[PDB]
């Protein structure tokens, strides 16, 4: 066990049968990659949140610096992509992750890792692969053939890693399934949450500028939240209520003045919720309580990173 | 006689002509193909192994990529099967008379620096300019593969990689070729050679399609194919045995025949024979038989070459 930890504010295990089954080992491993990116915001959070998880629960975790995968996904050259990987492990560690840190270049071009990407493209429709990447995929007019080996690369990535727990967003379900279908290993599959962006219309990401990066100053967290959507009495699709639910932690003591209620102390996520759904408690004293405590459960990543100065 | 006029002899394009007069003033300089490992060696490579060794009669320097590693991601099965064809086709063509260089393209298209060039080429390709480019090469397939776009950018990049200033193929590579041309800092010049029909006149002549003449073919199956042959009289557009009269044939060219229908035609030319038949001077019946019995006499020191083992 330690399964309802590790299930604690996931979207799906694919399947819980099989990660009960992993659970049973003396040894266990679980990987995740990631795109480097110049900001590290929420969203990264809250999946090392998640490998930190699957660490207390006795899993050997790795981190794929997927600096190949970018750079297939347009994001520039591989010598300055790899530079923003470096940066990228700094903060995840600075979050409280010790892992295994590999850049997916060390074994991502070696011959016999090229040949069965050959031999999985073989295997894979081009049907399958483009629908896998609707939601990875940079916006492009004219779409390039790397967008179909991304996936295929990231199917035999996992194949190298050879460990028994894959997780990604949601977003990523797709290619985990294809790897689950062409692979002799197949991976359990861990799927967080992708969270909406601060304006509400859409997937937070960090080509949009619509997230809260871990250093973030408060000055600017209390910004980014204050104008941030939030509709009263709306759950489903608002960003400080996704927020108050992954991160923070409970019971919770909302301040207000006498004349609005005064000050509210709220023992779960769940009784967050229908209050707020209610309209027992109003936007506005939502987003103070959730800005001030994501501030201190940010403050000592952002230290960390600029303790240096 | 002129190197540039050789070279353009029954060729069915040149991309360009004038990069082409360029790369001739060079004292050094290559060529090379790539052909897909094939069970039977046939019309259609013989007449690009002959265009090879044209250009090595102009001094270019010949490379003959066996492209395993593209057949292996065109369906074709395994690498040590493919591999296997492969040498069997190199004999083949040094059985045409071709010393170059051969190379499997495997022995360089999986290294780091190759693999990553790949990845920048797909980053500059469409998916629909690849697919374009696969049309008439792609192993026929219900659900088209990721391999199928694979292949176009691991055929650009073997040309970048192997510094050659002229690539030829036929006339169904020429999207690829233009997308080299396109894609990489030296463009390549291009030498296109056509493609045969069907011998049953429909269709272009295929691996694939068994309708062929292969070069080990016996006697009596090359007199049989092409007696069953697509001819009609006057009737030269499409025509396998005219293709064969004009690519294949050599001139003066003496087509025996009773004396009752006319005697011995001595056609020093292909066009006068294209001519002769076109008004319907020269019979079908009489054009199958001169051009399998001059097939047979080309074709046999290959068979001879090939079966000597035995
Ligand atoms: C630019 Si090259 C020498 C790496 C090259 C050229 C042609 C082929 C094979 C051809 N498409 C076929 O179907 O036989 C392969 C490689």
Same mark, same amino acid.
């Given at each position: 066990?330690?399964?309802?930890?590790?299930?604690?504010?996931?979207?799906?295990?694919?399947?819980?049968?099989?990660?009960?089954?992993?659970?049973?080992?003396?040894?266990?491993?679980?990987?995740?990659?990631?795109?480097?990116?110049?900001?590290?915001?929420?969203?990264?959070?809250?999946?090392?949140?998640?490998?930190?998880?699957?660490?207390?629960?006795?899993?050997?975790?790795?981190?794929?610096?997927?600096?190949?995968?970018?750079?297939?996904?347009?994001?520039?050259?591989?010598?300055?992509?790899?530079?923003?990987?470096?940066?990228?492990?700094?903060?995840?560690?600075?979050?409280?992750?010790?892992?295994?840190?590999?850049?997916?270049?060390?074994?991502?071009?070696?011959?016999?890792?090229?040949?069965?990407?050959?031999?999985?493209?073989?295997?894979?429709?081009?049907?399958?692969?483009?629908?896998?990447?609707?939601?990875?995929?940079?916006?492009?007019?004219?779409?390039?053939?790397?967008?179909?080996?991304?996936?295929?690369?990231?199917?035999?990535?996992?194949?190298?890693? #050879? !460990? %028994?727990?894959? @997780?990604?967003?949601? *977003?990523?379900?797709?290619?985990?399934?294809?790897?689950? $279908? +062409?692979? &002799?290993?197949?991976?359990?599959?861990?799927?967080?949450?992708?969270?909406?962006?601060?304006?509400?219309?859409?997937?937070?990401?960090?080509?949009?500028?619509?997230?809260?990066?871990?250093?973030?100053?408060?000055?600017?967290?209390?910004?980014?939240?204050?104008?941030?959507?939030?509709?009263?009495?709306?759950?489903?699709?608002?960003?400080?209520?996704?927020?108050?639910?992954?991160?923070?932690?409970?019971?919770?003591?909302?301040?207000?003045?006498?004349?609005? #209620? !005064? %000050?509210?102390? @709220?023992?779960?996520? *769940?009784?967050?919720?229908?209050?707020?759904?209610?309209? $027992? +408690?109003? &936007?506005?004293?939502?987003?103070?309580?959730?800005?001030?405590?994501?501030?201190?459960?940010?403050?000592?990543?952002?230290?960390?990173?600029?303790?240096?100065?």
């Amino acid at each position: 066990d330690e399964f309802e930890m590790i299930k604690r504010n996931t979207s799906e295990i694919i399947s819980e049968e099989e990660l009960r089954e992993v659970l049973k080992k003396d040894e266990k491993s679980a990987h995740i990659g990631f795109e480097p990116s110049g900001k590290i915001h929420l969203g990264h959070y809250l999946q090392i949140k998640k490998m930190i998880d699957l660490q207390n629960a006795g899993f050997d975790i790795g981190i794929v610096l997927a600096d190949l995968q970018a750079y297939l996904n347009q994001k520039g050259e591989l010598d300055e992509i790899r530079k923003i990987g470096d940066y990228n492990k700094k903060v995840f560690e600075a979050m409280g992750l010790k892992a295994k840190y590999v850049y997916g270049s060390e074994f991502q071009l070696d011959k016999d890792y090229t040949l069965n990407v050959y031999r999985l493209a073989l295997k894979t429709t081009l049907k399958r692969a483009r629908r896998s990447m609707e939601l990875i995929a940079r916006e492009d007019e004219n779409p390039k053939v790397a967008e179909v080996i991304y996936p295929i690369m990231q199917v035999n990535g996992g194949h190298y890693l #050879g !460990g %028994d727990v894959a @997780v990604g967003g949601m *977003e990523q379900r797709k290619i985990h399934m294809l790897a689950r $279908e +062409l692979l &002799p290993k197949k991976v359990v599959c861990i799927h967080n949450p992708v969270l909406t962006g601060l304006d509400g219309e859409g997937k937070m990401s960090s080509s949009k500028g619509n997230f809260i990066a871990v250093d973030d100053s408060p000055e600017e967290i209390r910004a980014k939240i204050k104008k941030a959507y939030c509709p009263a009495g709306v759950v489903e699709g608002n960003p400080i209520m996704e927020i108050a639910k992954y991160f923070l932690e409970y019971p919770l003591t909302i301040k207000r003045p006498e004349k609005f #209620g !005064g %000050d509210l102390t @709220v023992n779960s996520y *769940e009784e967050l919720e229908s209050l707020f759904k209610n309209k $027992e +408690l109003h &936007p506005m004293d939502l987003k103070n309580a959730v800005a001030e405590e994501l501030i201190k459960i940010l403050e000592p990543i952002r230290k960390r990173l600029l303790e240096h100065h």
